[PDB]
C-alpha cells in the first residue's frame, strides 16, 4: 500500500531532476507584465520551448535505466514525447496558484497570443481538465517520466526494455493516488486517460505552430529536430 524505501528513493530523485526546469513564476511574470504582439509571442514560445527541450533531455538521461537503452530508441523516445511533455508543463504552469485576478489575465494573454482560434478551445479544455485533477508536483513529475518512457512510441525497436523502465514509475504513481486520494478511486486512471489528449496535440503540433498569426515561422535548429517543422 505504502511506498517501499526503494520507491521513496525513486520519487525523491525524480522530483529533484524535475525541479531543474524554468520556474513557473519566471514564465507567468513575463506574460502578465505586458501585452506583446503575435510576432513577439511566437519568439517567446520558441525561446521557452528550446529551453524546455534542453532541460527535458537532462531530466530524461537521469531516468533510471534510460542511458542503458539502445541509442536509436533513446532518440525515438525524446522525439515522441517532447511536445507532450511541453503541453503537460504548460498545463502545470497554467494551473499554478496566482494572486486575485492574475489567472484571468494569464488566460486572456494566452487566448490573444497569436494561436489560431481552432486550437485555443482544445488547449484550454485540456488545461482546465488538468486543473480539476489538482495534481501535486510529484504527480506532474511522474506523469512526465511515464510520457517519456512510452513503449508504444513510433520506431522503438525494443519495447520490452522501455516497458521495464516505465513500470516502476507507474507503480509509484498508482500508490501515491491511493494514499493521497482514497476519496477519488479513479484518480490514477484519470491521470493516464489525460495522456490520450496529449497524444492528439502531438499529432497536430506542426499545424498548430504553422497556423500562428505571424508572417514568418522561424524555429531554432534544436526545435527543427525535435518538432515536424521547416
Amino acid at each position: 500500500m505504502e511506498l517501499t524505501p526503494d520507491q521513496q528513493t525513486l520519487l525523491h530523485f525524480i522530483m529533484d531532476s524535475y525541479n531543474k526546469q524554468r520556474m513557473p513564476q519566471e514564465i507567468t511574470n513575463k506574460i502578465l507584465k505586458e501585452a506583446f504582439s503575435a510576432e513577439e509571442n511566437f519568439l517567446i514560445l520558441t525561446e521557452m520551448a528550446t529551453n524546455h527541450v534542453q532541460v527535458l533531455v537532462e531530466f530524461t538521461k537521469k531516468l533510471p535505466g534510460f542511458q542503458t537503452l539502445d541509442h536509436e530508441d533513446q532518440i525515438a523516445l525524446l522525439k515522441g514525447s517532447a511536445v507532450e511533455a511541453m503541453f503537460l508543463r504548460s498545463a502545470e504552469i497554467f494551473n499554478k496558484k496566482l494572486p486575485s485576478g492574475h489567472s484571468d489575465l494569464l488566460e486572456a494573454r494566452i487566448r490573444n497570443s497569436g494561436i489560431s482560434d481552432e486550437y485555443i478551445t482544445p488547449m484550454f479544455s485540456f488545461y482546465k481538465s488538468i486543473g480539476e485533477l489538482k495534481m501535486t508536483q510529484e504527480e506532474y513529475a511522474l506523469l512526465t517520466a511515464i510520457v517519456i518512457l512510452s513503449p508504444d512510441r513510433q520506431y522503438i525497436k525494443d519495447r520490452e526494455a522501455v516497458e521495464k523502465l516505465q513500470e516502476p514509475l507507474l507503480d509509484v504513481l498508482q500508490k501515491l493516488c491511493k494514499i493521497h486520494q482514497p476519496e477519488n478511486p479513479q484518480h490514477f486512471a484519470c491521470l493516464l486517460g489525460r495522456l490520450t489528449e496529449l497524444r492528439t496535440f502531438n499529432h497536430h503540433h506542426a499545424e498548430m505552430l504553422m497556423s500562428w498569426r505571424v508572417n514568418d515561422h522561424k524555429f531554432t535548429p534544436l526545435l527543427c529536430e525535435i518538432w515536424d517543422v521547416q
Binding site: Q54, V57, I75, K79, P221, L222, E225
Partner: peptide
Amino acid sequence: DHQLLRYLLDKD
C-alpha cells in the same frame, strides 16, 4: 538527421 539531439544525449 537529428545531430543536436544525439549530441545532447551523448555529451558528459
